[PDB]
Design a binder for this molecule. Structure first.
Ligand SMILES: NNC(=O)[C@@H]1CC[C@H](c2ccc(Cl)cc2)O1
Ligand SMILES: [Cl-]
Ligand SMILES: [Cl-]
Ligand SMILES: [Cl-]
Ligand SMILES: [Cl-]
Ligand SMILES: [Mn+2]
Length: 340
């Protein structure tokens, strides 16, 4: 039967089922006031599927100059054409190769650049903004979005949205690497999975995806979602409560010291965006510091709501196209205030 919602993370994560239900705010706002992330499924069913394909981005924008990142070693690939990224998104035999002759796992950096999404892609902008869940919070002019209403005593978000495009991590060694490293944002955000590309070329790697979700601490119901094998999994997230950010900084200063980094005692390992918490580090955080997070698998059409101040990291399972919008809810406005 159709239902309004369900729970993941053993009851700690709200999952809303109808992105355009006018009564979602009634269920959402209690979880949101407590500092929790929220998942909303089904957004892909509201979008024009032809606007979100890798082959359309390559056809329309392929002659633009861009920089890529090698996710395995953080090497920058400077001033290449964006078609060199898009044409290898699903077809492994077309990917740029490292010196060892393996196809690289690449992230497309800052594309579209800065605040240029709306100017470059007006039809995409309209399709996304008109279908975002919790629109009183997430729309630029929503009643519960304070972004346009705050004085300079508050850090205001840039004009969005922002696109996040990267290949999937493939090997056992790749399990310890991030697509986006651990960091925090002073605004709230909603991140929507608009496309998942699963290769079939070098496509017997669906076996090491099963294990990665396991090692990632995903709950039994999310696995039922994986094990049932009807929905396409895009990315594994770990999110931590804003109240636990300093304890995570204490762990990362201790590990940086153990590994021979020479850091001042006050430096900020979260702001540095240099760490990915692998299974070893997540266990150490729980056991040594008492900190539990939320392990979230973002499937095609899932919208992840990330609270202001919450440390978070992202690991792509398959090739992903994500689109994110920042907002400032009244519940979390303290996180962008410039005093005390
Ligand atoms: N529709 N095309 C595909 O390839 C299907 C769809 C989603 C499914 C999958 C599910 C779980 C895991 Cl672990 C890996 C792959 O793959
Ligand atoms: Cl908070
Ligand atoms: Cl467009
Ligand atoms: Cl709303
Ligand atoms: Cl990063
Ligand atoms: Mn972020």
């Amino acid at each position: 039967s159709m239902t309004s919602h369900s729970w993941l993370c053993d009851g700690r994560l709200l999952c809303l089922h109808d992105p355009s239900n006018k009564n979602n705010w009634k269920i959402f706002r209690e979880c949101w006031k407590q500092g929790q992330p929220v998942l909303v499924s089904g957004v892909h069913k509201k979008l024009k599927s032809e606007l979100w394909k890798p082959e359309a981005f390559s056809q329309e924008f392929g002659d633009q100059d861009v920089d890529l990142v090698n996710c395995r070693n953080c090497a920058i690939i400077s001033d290449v054409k964006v078609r060199d990224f898009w044409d290898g998104f699903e077809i492994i035999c077309k990917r740029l190769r490292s010196e060892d002759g393996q196809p690289m796992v690449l992230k497309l950096k800052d594309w579209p650049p800065g605040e240029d999404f709306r100017d470059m892609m007006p039809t995409r902008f309209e399709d996304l903004m008109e279908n975002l869940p919790l629109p009183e919070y997430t729309k630029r002019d929503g009643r519960l979005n304070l972004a346009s209403r705050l004085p300079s005593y508050f850090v205001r978000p840039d004009l969005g949205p922002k696109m996040y495009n990267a290949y999937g991590l493939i090997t056992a060694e790749d399990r310890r690497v991030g697509t986006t490293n651990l960091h925090l944002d002073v605004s709230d955000a909603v991140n929507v999975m608009v496309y998942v590309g699963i290769p079939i070329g070098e496509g017997a790697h669906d076996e090491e995806v099963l294990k990665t979700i396991d090692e990632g601490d995903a709950d039994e119901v999310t696995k039922e979602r994986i094990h049932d094998h009807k929905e396409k999994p895009g990315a594994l997230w770990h999110i931590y409560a804003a109240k636990d950010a300093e304890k995570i900084r204490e762990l990362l200063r201790k590990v940086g010291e153990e590994q021979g980094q020479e850091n001042p005692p006050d430096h900020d390992p979260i702001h540095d965006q240099s760490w990915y918490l692998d299974q070893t580090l997540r266990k150490r955080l729980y056991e040594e510091y008492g900190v539990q997070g939320w392990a979230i698998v973002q499937f095609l059409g899932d919208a992840v709501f990330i609270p202001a101040g919450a440390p978070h990291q992202v690991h792509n399972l398959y090739s992903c196209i994500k689109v994110a919008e920042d907002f400032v809810s009244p519940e979390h406005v303290k996180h962008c205030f410039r005093l005390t």
